[PDB]
mmCIF file of C-alpha atoms in Angstrom:
data_model
loop_
_atom_site.group_PDB
_atom_site.id
_atom_site.type_symbol
_atom_site.label_atom_id
_atom_site.label_comp_id
_atom_site.label_asym_id
_atom_site.label_seq_id
_atom_site.Cartn_x
_atom_site.Cartn_y
_atom_site.Cartn_z
ATOM 1 C CA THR A 1 206.355 16.331 150.056
ATOM 2 C CA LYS A 2 209.151 16.778 147.515
ATOM 3 C CA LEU A 3 209.830 18.877 144.427
ATOM 4 C CA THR A 4 210.268 17.317 140.973
ATOM 5 C CA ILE A 5 212.081 19.025 138.080
ATOM 6 C CA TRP A 6 212.406 18.011 134.424
ATOM 7 C CA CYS A 7 215.517 19.735 133.048
ATOM 8 C CA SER A 8 218.127 19.384 130.316
ATOM 9 C CA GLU A 9 221.161 17.116 130.627
ATOM 10 C CA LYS A 10 223.638 19.961 131.175
ATOM 11 C CA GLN A 11 221.447 21.364 133.992
ATOM 12 C CA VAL A 12 221.089 18.281 136.238
ATOM 13 C CA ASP A 13 224.222 18.759 138.366
ATOM 14 C CA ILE A 14 223.588 22.478 138.918
ATOM 15 C CA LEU A 15 219.951 21.947 139.893
ATOM 16 C CA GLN A 16 220.753 18.946 142.120
ATOM 17 C CA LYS A 17 223.235 20.972 144.178
ATOM 18 C CA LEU A 18 220.828 23.922 144.293
ATOM 19 C CA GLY A 19 218.073 21.596 145.486
ATOM 20 C CA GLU A 20 220.353 20.413 148.290
ATOM 21 C CA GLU A 21 220.595 24.046 149.407
ATOM 22 C CA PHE A 22 216.797 24.263 149.239
ATOM 23 C CA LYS A 23 216.384 21.075 151.283
ATOM 24 C CA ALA A 24 218.673 22.270 154.082
ATOM 25 C CA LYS A 25 216.758 25.532 154.514
ATOM 26 C CA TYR A 26 213.160 24.345 153.969
ATOM 27 C CA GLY A 27 213.329 20.578 154.551
ATOM 28 C CA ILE A 28 211.823 19.749 151.153
ATOM 29 C CA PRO A 29 213.972 17.538 148.889
ATOM 30 C CA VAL A 30 214.257 18.225 145.168
ATOM 31 C CA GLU A 31 214.336 15.399 142.610
ATOM 32 C CA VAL A 32 216.023 16.390 139.337
ATOM 33 C CA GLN A 33 215.590 14.319 136.174
ATOM 34 C CA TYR A 34 216.844 14.909 132.646
ATOM 35 C CA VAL A 35 214.038 14.751 130.063
ATOM 36 C CA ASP A 36 214.406 15.841 126.439
ATOM 37 C CA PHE A 37 212.349 18.797 125.187
ATOM 38 C CA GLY A 38 210.123 16.700 122.931
ATOM 39 C CA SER A 39 209.212 14.239 125.680
ATOM 40 C CA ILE A 40 208.782 17.009 128.261
ATOM 41 C CA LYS A 41 205.948 18.494 126.222
ATOM 42 C CA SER A 42 204.268 15.166 125.455
ATOM 43 C CA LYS A 43 204.476 14.050 129.099
ATOM 44 C CA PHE A 44 203.415 17.434 130.503
ATOM 45 C CA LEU A 45 200.372 17.698 128.226
ATOM 46 C CA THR A 46 198.803 14.569 129.730
ATOM 47 C CA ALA A 47 200.206 14.684 133.270
ATOM 48 C CA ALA A 48 199.608 18.367 134.058
ATOM 49 C CA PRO A 49 195.780 18.372 133.604
ATOM 50 C CA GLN A 50 195.568 15.816 136.446
ATOM 51 C CA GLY A 51 197.945 17.609 138.804
ATOM 52 C CA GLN A 52 200.796 15.246 137.960
ATOM 53 C CA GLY A 53 204.065 15.696 136.133
ATOM 54 C CA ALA A 54 207.041 17.677 137.328
ATOM 55 C CA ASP A 55 206.476 20.756 139.474
ATOM 56 C CA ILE A 56 209.056 22.638 137.363
ATOM 57 C CA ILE A 57 209.878 22.007 133.695
ATOM 58 C CA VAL A 58 212.128 23.538 131.080
ATOM 59 C CA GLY A 59 210.932 24.102 127.549
ATOM 60 C CA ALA A 60 210.694 26.385 124.566
ATOM 61 C CA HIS A 61 208.904 29.718 124.757
ATOM 62 C CA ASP A 62 206.810 28.671 121.734
ATOM 63 C CA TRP A 63 204.759 26.462 124.075
ATOM 64 C CA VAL A 64 203.671 29.275 126.390
ATOM 65 C CA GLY A 65 200.537 30.561 124.677
ATOM 66 C CA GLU A 66 198.762 27.213 124.579
ATOM 67 C CA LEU A 67 199.962 26.044 128.000
ATOM 68 C CA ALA A 68 198.836 29.385 129.477
ATOM 69 C CA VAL A 69 195.347 29.477 127.920
ATOM 70 C CA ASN A 70 194.735 25.886 129.046
ATOM 71 C CA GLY A 71 195.784 26.809 132.597
ATOM 72 C CA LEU A 72 198.700 24.366 132.776
ATOM 73 C CA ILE A 73 201.547 26.763 133.662
ATOM 74 C CA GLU A 74 201.434 29.256 136.529
ATOM 75 C CA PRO A 75 201.879 33.036 136.148
ATOM 76 C CA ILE A 76 205.224 34.154 137.555
ATOM 77 C CA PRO A 77 204.690 36.795 140.266
ATOM 78 C CA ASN A 78 206.692 39.936 139.723
ATOM 79 C CA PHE A 79 209.927 39.969 141.702
ATOM 80 C CA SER A 80 212.697 42.547 141.780
ATOM 81 C CA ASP A 81 215.398 40.373 140.177
ATOM 82 C CA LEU A 82 213.342 40.358 136.953
ATOM 83 C CA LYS A 83 214.836 43.767 136.095
ATOM 84 C CA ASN A 84 218.081 41.973 135.158
ATOM 85 C CA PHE A 85 216.502 39.884 132.356
ATOM 86 C CA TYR A 86 216.359 40.983 128.719
ATOM 87 C CA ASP A 87 212.943 42.346 127.768
ATOM 88 C CA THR A 88 212.899 40.083 124.704
ATOM 89 C CA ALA A 89 213.430 37.011 126.890
ATOM 90 C CA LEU A 90 210.650 38.013 129.288
ATOM 91 C CA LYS A 91 208.248 38.876 126.448
ATOM 92 C CA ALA A 92 208.967 35.480 124.887
ATOM 93 C CA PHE A 93 207.632 33.780 128.024
ATOM 94 C CA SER A 94 204.690 36.178 128.394
ATOM 95 C CA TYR A 95 201.124 35.866 127.159
ATOM 96 C CA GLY A 96 198.061 38.035 127.672
ATOM 97 C CA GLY A 97 200.002 40.518 129.790
ATOM 98 C CA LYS A 98 201.399 37.948 132.242
ATOM 99 C CA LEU A 99 204.835 36.375 132.627
ATOM 100 C CA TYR A 100 204.669 32.568 132.540
ATOM 101 C CA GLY A 101 208.308 31.521 132.850
ATOM 102 C CA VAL A 102 211.835 32.441 133.849
ATOM 103 C CA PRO A 103 214.089 32.296 130.759
ATOM 104 C CA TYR A 104 217.667 31.088 130.753
ATOM 105 C CA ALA A 105 218.756 31.100 127.092
ATOM 106 C CA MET A 106 218.156 32.981 123.841
ATOM 107 C CA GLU A 107 218.935 32.270 120.200
ATOM 108 C CA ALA A 108 219.010 34.746 117.303
ATOM 109 C CA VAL A 109 220.928 35.421 114.096
ATOM 110 C CA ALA A 110 223.331 38.321 113.536
ATOM 111 C CA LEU A 111 225.647 39.633 110.838
ATOM 112 C CA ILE A 112 228.719 37.427 110.400
ATOM 113 C CA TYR A 113 231.482 38.888 108.249
ATOM 114 C CA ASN A 114 234.911 37.947 106.907
ATOM 115 C CA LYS A 115 237.480 40.514 108.045
ATOM 116 C CA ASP A 116 239.607 39.863 104.952
ATOM 117 C CA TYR A 117 236.899 41.791 103.060
ATOM 118 C CA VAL A 118 235.186 44.064 105.624
ATOM 119 C CA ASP A 119 237.268 46.580 107.591
ATOM 120 C CA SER A 120 234.378 48.066 109.606
ATOM 121 C CA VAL A 121 230.846 46.849 110.267
ATOM 122 C CA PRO A 122 228.468 48.820 107.993
ATOM 123 C CA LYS A 123 226.457 51.302 110.020
ATOM 124 C CA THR A 124 223.268 50.981 107.926
ATOM 125 C CA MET A 125 221.773 48.572 105.401
ATOM 126 C CA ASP A 126 222.360 51.174 102.672
ATOM 127 C CA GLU A 127 226.065 51.150 103.584
ATOM 128 C CA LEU A 128 226.031 47.344 103.643
ATOM 129 C CA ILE A 129 224.507 47.294 100.147
ATOM 130 C CA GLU A 130 227.133 49.675 98.762
ATOM 131 C CA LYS A 131 229.945 47.701 100.413
ATOM 132 C CA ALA A 132 228.521 44.454 99.002
ATOM 133 C CA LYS A 133 228.457 45.914 95.477
ATOM 134 C CA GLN A 134 232.039 47.142 95.836
ATOM 135 C CA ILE A 135 233.128 43.683 97.006
ATOM 136 C CA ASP A 136 231.271 41.998 94.134
ATOM 137 C CA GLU A 137 233.028 44.398 91.755
ATOM 138 C CA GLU A 138 236.537 44.034 93.197
ATOM 139 C CA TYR A 139 236.592 40.221 93.052
ATOM 140 C CA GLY A 140 234.636 39.869 89.796
ATOM 141 C CA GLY A 141 231.932 37.705 91.322
ATOM 142 C CA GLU A 142 234.321 35.218 92.925
ATOM 143 C CA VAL A 143 233.470 36.684 96.347
ATOM 144 C CA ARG A 144 229.878 37.467 97.283
ATOM 145 C CA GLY A 145 229.629 40.738 99.171
ATOM 146 C CA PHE A 146 226.381 39.701 100.869
ATOM 147 C CA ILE A 147 224.519 36.389 100.790
ATOM 148 C CA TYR A 148 221.964 34.691 103.041
ATOM 149 C CA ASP A 149 218.922 32.390 102.923
ATOM 150 C CA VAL A 150 216.790 35.154 101.467
ATOM 151 C CA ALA A 151 213.562 33.245 100.689
ATOM 152 C CA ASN A 152 213.344 31.816 104.239
ATOM 153 C CA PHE A 153 211.029 33.886 106.423
ATOM 154 C CA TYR A 154 213.054 33.106 109.553
ATOM 155 C CA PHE A 155 216.158 34.737 108.038
ATOM 156 C CA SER A 156 214.397 37.606 106.212
ATOM 157 C CA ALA A 157 212.273 38.546 109.237
ATOM 158 C CA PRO A 158 214.825 41.126 110.538
ATOM 159 C CA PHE A 159 213.890 43.286 107.550
ATOM 160 C CA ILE A 160 210.150 42.584 107.323
ATOM 161 C CA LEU A 161 209.615 42.985 111.078
ATOM 162 C CA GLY A 162 212.179 45.767 111.524
ATOM 163 C CA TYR A 163 210.276 48.119 109.226
ATOM 164 C CA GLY A 164 206.960 47.623 111.044
ATOM 165 C CA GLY A 165 205.565 44.267 109.976
ATOM 166 C CA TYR A 166 204.192 41.965 112.664
ATOM 167 C CA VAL A 167 202.826 38.429 112.737
ATOM 168 C CA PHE A 168 199.987 38.729 115.262
ATOM 169 C CA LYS A 169 198.839 41.974 116.852
ATOM 170 C CA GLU A 170 199.394 42.111 120.610
ATOM 171 C CA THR A 171 196.303 42.806 122.739
ATOM 172 C CA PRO A 172 195.787 42.740 126.525
ATOM 173 C CA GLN A 173 193.783 39.502 126.126
ATOM 174 C CA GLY A 174 196.719 37.928 124.235
ATOM 175 C CA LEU A 175 197.811 37.720 120.627
ATOM 176 C CA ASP A 176 195.003 38.483 118.187
ATOM 177 C CA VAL A 177 195.583 35.801 115.548
ATOM 178 C CA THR A 178 192.794 37.391 113.501
ATOM 179 C CA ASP A 179 194.929 40.566 113.144
ATOM 180 C CA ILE A 180 197.907 39.625 110.958
ATOM 181 C CA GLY A 181 200.298 42.408 110.026
ATOM 182 C CA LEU A 182 202.462 40.651 107.457
ATOM 183 C CA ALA A 183 201.074 42.830 104.642
ATOM 184 C CA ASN A 184 200.926 46.260 106.307
ATOM 185 C CA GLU A 185 203.044 49.196 105.124
ATOM 186 C CA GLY A 186 205.999 48.184 107.293
ATOM 187 C CA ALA A 187 206.044 44.619 105.979
ATOM 188 C CA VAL A 188 205.818 45.948 102.410
ATOM 189 C CA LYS A 189 208.721 48.313 103.069
ATOM 190 C CA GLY A 190 210.844 45.511 104.514
ATOM 191 C CA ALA A 191 210.027 43.183 101.629
ATOM 192 C CA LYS A 192 210.731 45.983 99.129
ATOM 193 C CA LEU A 193 214.198 46.412 100.632
ATOM 194 C CA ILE A 194 214.834 42.697 100.066
ATOM 195 C CA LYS A 195 213.535 43.081 96.509
ATOM 196 C CA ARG A 196 215.829 46.079 95.977
ATOM 197 C CA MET A 197 218.863 44.016 96.990
ATOM 198 C CA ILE A 198 217.749 41.402 94.441
ATOM 199 C CA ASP A 199 217.170 43.996 91.712
ATOM 200 C CA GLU A 200 220.605 45.595 92.258
ATOM 201 C CA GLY A 201 222.322 42.179 92.240
ATOM 202 C CA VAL A 202 223.494 42.193 95.853
ATOM 203 C CA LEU A 203 221.270 39.140 96.427
ATOM 204 C CA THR A 204 220.031 36.537 93.954
ATOM 205 C CA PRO A 205 216.945 34.282 93.887
ATOM 206 C CA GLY A 206 219.272 31.282 94.143
ATOM 207 C CA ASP A 207 220.632 32.275 97.555
ATOM 208 C CA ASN A 208 219.795 29.627 100.170
ATOM 209 C CA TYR A 209 221.265 28.428 103.455
ATOM 210 C CA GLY A 210 223.559 25.853 101.853
ATOM 211 C CA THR A 211 225.102 28.204 99.299
ATOM 212 C CA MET A 212 225.607 30.936 101.915
ATOM 213 C CA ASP A 213 227.095 28.500 104.439
ATOM 214 C CA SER A 214 229.478 26.707 102.073
ATOM 215 C CA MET A 215 230.598 29.954 100.425
ATOM 216 C CA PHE A 216 231.444 31.535 103.784
ATOM 217 C CA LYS A 217 233.387 28.444 104.893
ATOM 218 C CA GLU A 218 235.450 28.629 101.698
ATOM 219 C CA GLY A 219 236.360 32.286 102.237
ATOM 220 C CA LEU A 220 234.206 33.475 99.319
ATOM 221 C CA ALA A 221 231.458 35.389 101.174
ATOM 222 C CA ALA A 222 232.057 38.728 102.875
ATOM 223 C CA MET A 223 228.824 39.151 104.868
ATOM 224 C CA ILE A 224 226.114 36.634 105.817
ATOM 225 C CA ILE A 225 223.210 36.266 108.247
ATOM 226 C CA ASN A 226 223.465 33.246 110.540
ATOM 227 C CA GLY A 227 223.446 32.159 114.173
ATOM 228 C CA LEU A 228 225.893 30.992 116.816
ATOM 229 C CA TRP A 229 225.291 27.367 115.769
ATOM 230 C CA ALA A 230 227.486 27.848 112.674
ATOM 231 C CA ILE A 231 230.454 29.589 114.323
ATOM 232 C CA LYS A 232 232.410 26.422 115.144
ATOM 233 C CA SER A 233 232.447 25.341 111.495
ATOM 234 C CA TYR A 234 233.695 28.786 110.431
ATOM 235 C CA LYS A 235 236.425 28.791 113.085
ATOM 236 C CA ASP A 236 237.547 25.310 112.030
ATOM 237 C CA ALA A 237 237.668 26.487 108.407
ATOM 238 C CA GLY A 238 240.145 29.194 109.435
ATOM 239 C CA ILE A 239 237.903 32.177 108.686
ATOM 240 C CA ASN A 240 238.914 35.418 110.418
ATOM 241 C CA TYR A 241 235.273 36.214 111.086
ATOM 242 C CA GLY A 242 233.501 38.831 113.149
ATOM 243 C CA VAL A 243 229.955 39.013 114.509
ATOM 244 C CA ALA A 244 227.791 42.115 114.860
ATOM 245 C CA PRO A 245 224.073 42.950 114.956
ATOM 246 C CA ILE A 246 222.479 43.352 111.538
ATOM 247 C CA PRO A 247 222.912 47.031 110.542
ATOM 248 C CA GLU A 248 220.033 49.460 110.998
ATOM 249 C CA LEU A 249 217.518 49.351 108.148
ATOM 250 C CA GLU A 250 217.572 53.170 108.315
ATOM 251 C CA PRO A 251 218.975 55.625 110.855
ATOM 252 C CA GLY A 252 216.867 55.028 113.954
ATOM 253 C CA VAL A 253 215.189 51.866 112.606
ATOM 254 C CA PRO A 254 216.905 48.714 113.928
ATOM 255 C CA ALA A 255 216.762 45.287 112.373
ATOM 256 C CA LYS A 256 214.414 43.045 114.370
ATOM 257 C CA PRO A 257 215.377 39.357 114.134
ATOM 258 C CA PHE A 258 213.284 36.501 115.435
ATOM 259 C CA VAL A 259 214.374 35.170 118.826
ATOM 260 C CA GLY A 260 213.908 31.718 120.344
ATOM 261 C CA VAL A 261 214.027 31.423 124.123
ATOM 262 C CA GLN A 262 214.220 28.534 126.597
ATOM 263 C CA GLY A 263 213.048 28.808 130.180
ATOM 264 C CA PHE A 264 211.630 27.306 133.362
ATOM 265 C CA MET A 265 207.874 26.977 133.933
ATOM 266 C CA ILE A 266 205.706 26.033 136.923
ATOM 267 C CA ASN A 267 203.010 23.342 136.883
ATOM 268 C CA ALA A 268 199.805 25.287 137.625
ATOM 269 C CA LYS A 269 197.943 22.111 138.655
ATOM 270 C CA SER A 270 200.612 20.892 141.095
ATOM 271 C CA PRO A 271 199.859 20.935 144.843
ATOM 272 C CA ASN A 272 203.462 22.154 145.290
ATOM 273 C CA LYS A 273 203.326 25.246 143.052
ATOM 274 C CA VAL A 274 204.017 27.605 146.002
ATOM 275 C CA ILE A 275 207.163 25.763 147.108
ATOM 276 C CA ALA A 276 208.063 25.211 143.436
ATOM 277 C CA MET A 277 207.697 28.932 142.732
ATOM 278 C CA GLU A 278 209.909 29.834 145.731
ATOM 279 C CA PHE A 279 212.739 27.672 144.355
ATOM 280 C CA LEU A 280 212.302 29.020 140.835
ATOM 281 C CA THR A 281 212.345 32.704 141.791
ATOM 282 C CA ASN A 282 214.754 32.555 144.758
ATOM 283 C CA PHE A 283 217.166 29.792 143.672
ATOM 284 C CA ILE A 284 217.033 28.957 139.961
ATOM 285 C CA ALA A 285 216.580 32.559 138.806
ATOM 286 C CA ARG A 286 219.524 34.012 140.755
ATOM 287 C CA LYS A 287 222.482 35.482 138.862
ATOM 288 C CA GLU A 288 224.904 32.907 140.304
ATOM 289 C CA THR A 289 222.784 29.970 139.125
ATOM 290 C CA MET A 290 222.196 31.451 135.662
ATOM 291 C CA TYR A 291 225.937 32.006 135.229
ATOM 292 C CA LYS A 292 226.616 28.368 136.125
ATOM 293 C CA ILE A 293 223.868 27.350 133.698
ATOM 294 C CA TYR A 294 225.624 29.370 130.999
ATOM 295 C CA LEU A 295 229.047 27.858 131.741
ATOM 296 C CA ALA A 296 227.704 24.302 131.578
ATOM 297 C CA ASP A 297 225.924 24.985 128.256
ATOM 298 C CA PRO A 298 226.966 28.278 126.604
ATOM 299 C CA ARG A 299 223.841 29.699 124.998
ATOM 300 C CA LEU A 300 223.022 33.392 124.775
ATOM 301 C CA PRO A 301 222.102 34.304 128.382
ATOM 302 C CA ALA A 302 218.709 35.707 129.316
ATOM 303 C CA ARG A 303 220.154 37.907 132.096
ATOM 304 C CA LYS A 304 222.010 41.124 131.267
ATOM 305 C CA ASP A 305 224.301 40.809 134.282
ATOM 306 C CA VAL A 306 225.271 37.280 133.242
ATOM 307 C CA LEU A 307 226.414 38.561 129.845
ATOM 308 C CA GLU A 308 228.528 41.139 131.699
ATOM 309 C CA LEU A 309 230.427 38.209 133.232
ATOM 310 C CA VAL A 310 231.375 36.886 129.803
ATOM 311 C CA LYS A 311 234.561 37.407 129.420
ATOM 312 C CA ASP A 312 236.348 35.597 126.630
ATOM 313 C CA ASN A 313 233.447 35.243 124.149
ATOM 314 C CA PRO A 314 232.948 38.301 121.887
ATOM 315 C CA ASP A 315 230.696 36.228 119.606
ATOM 316 C CA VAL A 316 228.134 35.629 122.375
ATOM 317 C CA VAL A 317 228.154 39.360 123.174
ATOM 318 C CA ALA A 318 227.274 40.236 119.572
ATOM 319 C CA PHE A 319 224.601 37.541 119.222
ATOM 320 C CA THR A 320 223.044 38.436 122.586
ATOM 321 C CA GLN A 321 222.932 42.089 121.557
ATOM 322 C CA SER A 322 221.215 41.025 118.328
ATOM 323 C CA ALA A 323 218.653 39.039 120.323
ATOM 324 C CA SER A 324 217.983 42.027 122.595
ATOM 325 C CA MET A 325 216.672 44.119 119.679
ATOM 326 C CA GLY A 326 214.778 41.135 118.253
ATOM 327 C CA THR A 327 211.254 39.895 118.801
ATOM 328 C CA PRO A 328 210.112 36.463 120.009
ATOM 329 C CA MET A 329 208.771 34.028 117.490
ATOM 330 C CA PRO A 330 205.038 34.261 118.291
ATOM 331 C CA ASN A 331 204.355 31.801 121.105
ATOM 332 C CA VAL A 332 200.957 30.544 119.870
ATOM 333 C CA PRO A 333 200.028 27.451 117.829
ATOM 334 C CA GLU A 334 198.756 29.621 114.953
ATOM 335 C CA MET A 335 202.373 30.504 114.116
ATOM 336 C CA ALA A 336 202.764 27.090 112.451
ATOM 337 C CA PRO A 337 201.378 27.930 108.952
ATOM 338 C CA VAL A 338 203.156 31.313 108.851
ATOM 339 C CA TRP A 339 206.593 29.918 107.968
ATOM 340 C CA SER A 340 205.683 28.230 104.684
ATOM 341 C CA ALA A 341 203.216 30.891 103.516
ATOM 342 C CA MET A 342 205.784 33.663 104.016
ATOM 343 C CA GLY A 343 208.569 31.585 102.487
ATOM 344 C CA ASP A 344 206.439 31.112 99.377
ATOM 345 C CA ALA A 345 205.641 34.840 99.295
ATOM 346 C CA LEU A 346 209.339 35.710 99.529
ATOM 347 C CA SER A 347 210.262 33.313 96.712
ATOM 348 C CA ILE A 348 207.492 34.779 94.554
ATOM 349 C CA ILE A 349 208.703 38.317 95.302
ATOM 350 C CA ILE A 350 212.403 37.729 94.651
ATOM 351 C CA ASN A 351 211.656 35.859 91.404
ATOM 352 C CA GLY A 352 209.526 38.774 90.168
ATOM 353 C CA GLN A 353 206.383 36.645 89.886
ATOM 354 C CA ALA A 354 204.110 39.086 91.751
ATOM 355 C CA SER A 355 204.312 42.527 93.288
ATOM 356 C CA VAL A 356 205.367 42.800 96.922
ATOM 357 C CA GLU A 357 201.860 43.949 97.854
ATOM 358 C CA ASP A 358 200.030 41.110 96.092
ATOM 359 C CA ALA A 359 202.382 38.369 97.310
ATOM 360 C CA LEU A 360 202.126 39.479 100.946
ATOM 361 C CA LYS A 361 198.339 39.850 100.881
ATOM 362 C CA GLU A 362 198.080 36.352 99.387
ATOM 363 C CA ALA A 363 200.322 35.038 102.171
ATOM 364 C CA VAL A 364 198.028 36.521 104.833
ATOM 365 C CA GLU A 365 194.960 35.040 103.124
ATOM 366 C CA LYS A 366 196.502 31.564 103.133
ATOM 367 C CA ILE A 367 197.580 31.864 106.775
ATOM 368 C CA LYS A 368 194.021 32.761 107.797
ATOM 369 C CA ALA A 369 192.627 29.930 105.663
ATOM 370 C CA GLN A 370 194.913 27.405 107.368
ATOM 371 C CA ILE A 371 194.236 28.808 110.847
ATOM 372 C CA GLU A 372 190.527 28.315 110.130
ATOM 373 C CA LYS A 373 190.901 24.647 109.149
#
């Protein structure tokens, strides 16, 4: 009997050597194969129901809810080392009160700012708004104090979710996709704060990803909301940038960005799940392995004590801190219609074509209608 793993390209070498350690101690070889995320899911969905497919796979946390309900991935037994993982990363791989994977990477946006215009990170969103107005005034509109992809629900979620909005209500039986909180009082308050930034001129209805991104590269945007994926282009453009978590919406009320997480999962139909689980919890999950995984592919780490090891990367520290206060993108298939419905609602709001209340309630109605079909 041998163990089979489907992993990413930059994980093969690390997992092959680790498997050699596992073979020496237990006498079970480990076969490691690179498979891309898209093909992992399509292969797993038809191999796993028969007991085939890899014993261990990597994948996105978004898959967990459906793989868990269909009994294809195995609940991770609690082990002590779990205390060293970010709560957001563990929640992202949890469903119905059970952990279903061991995460290794996170991704979330943060505040990125040009230090030629911002001397200290604003402590609150009210301070950010005042600073943005002052910057707009000082440079006569040539420099935008604050700009981001405002009508995109992924980028505006820190405000809508931070004030109390939620996508699906969490219950002990799993996410209740019949209970959608995108129009409750918190969501309305978050959307009203976005609308206030529009009304005061700090944001405009024409703000989108492209205009934000190009303006920051050219040195004409003081503060933006973006992720680690854009940092290289800003460095190459010669921007003296800094990264920090999005300022508190109010004192004591943090911004709550969406977080994407990648992790390892166990084939629940495999005859080798016990040996596969041992290797996952005792070998893959260890701090030393996760640090090597980070070095070979620097993504925001899922372990707190791995971040402590880094080192020379202040950007990763800021983005990881942003992810820690964030919330996972809901890991169920019913999340799919939410993006476009909320993006339409945001556009309607910022263009003054409906009240915040009416636009959000319409968005929830359309989400439910599409979930039903």
